[PDB]
Design a protein around this nucleic acid. Structure first.
Length: 183
DNA sequence: TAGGGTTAG
């Protein structure tokens, strides 16, 4: 049994009339669920438009993700990798992006080092090892872009990532403006 | 479209 958090998916944009029932009936197509709930307001008991589904294996959730789009109760919904309550705390951790910030890479780090490790998550579109302006000095971090936003999510949820022989930190990419709003 | 009486004795 892999971790619960890694076996659950967040389902967004659910139709107001979606119930654990319907939710379950749909996603069981890709495997055995072990949890399936529609979140709603404690008082009006009215749906909040989102819910979670959990399978018995991460392999099965991978199967479901490869199955997008997902239409439930006549409404295209949006499945995502469930982000731990704790990380949901972090600045813009729920936004949908295709680019990732990779911090703490060695000076001799080259592009192949990043491809080496990152390709296993999805089609890479761009790699950028940031250097200093006019200085040309390596800055110890980079940006990697993918075709699927899920490739990024499949990553940010893992805790460790080894690039060029050592662990490095990975976070969703935020625009210069988002950074400032965060700070 | 970010969690269910689920976070410091």
């Amino acid at each position: 049994k892999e971790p619960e958090q890694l076996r659950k998916l967040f389902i967004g944009g659910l139709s107001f009339e979606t119930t654990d029932e319907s939710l379950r009936s749909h996603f069981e197509q890709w495997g055995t669920l072990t949890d399936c709930v529609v979140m709603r307001d404690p008082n009006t008991k009215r749906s909040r438009g989102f819910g979670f589904v959990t399978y018995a294996t991460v392999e099965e959730v991978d199967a479901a993700m490869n199955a997008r789009p997902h239409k439930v109760d006549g409404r295209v919904v949006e499945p995502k990798r469930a982000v731990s309550r704790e990380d949901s705390q972090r600045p813009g951790a729920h936004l949908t992006v295709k680019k990732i910030f990779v911090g703490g890479i060695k000076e001799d780090t080259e592009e192949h080092h990043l491809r080496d490790y990152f390709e296993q998550y999805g089609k890479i579109e761009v790699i950028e090892i940031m250097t200093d302006r006019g200085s040309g000095k390596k800055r110890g971090f980079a940006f990697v872009t993918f075709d699927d936003h899920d490739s990024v999510d499949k990553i940010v949820i893992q805790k460790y990532h080894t690039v060029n022989g050592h662990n490095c930190e990975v976070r969703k990419a935020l625009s210069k403006q988002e950074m400032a709003s965060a700070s």
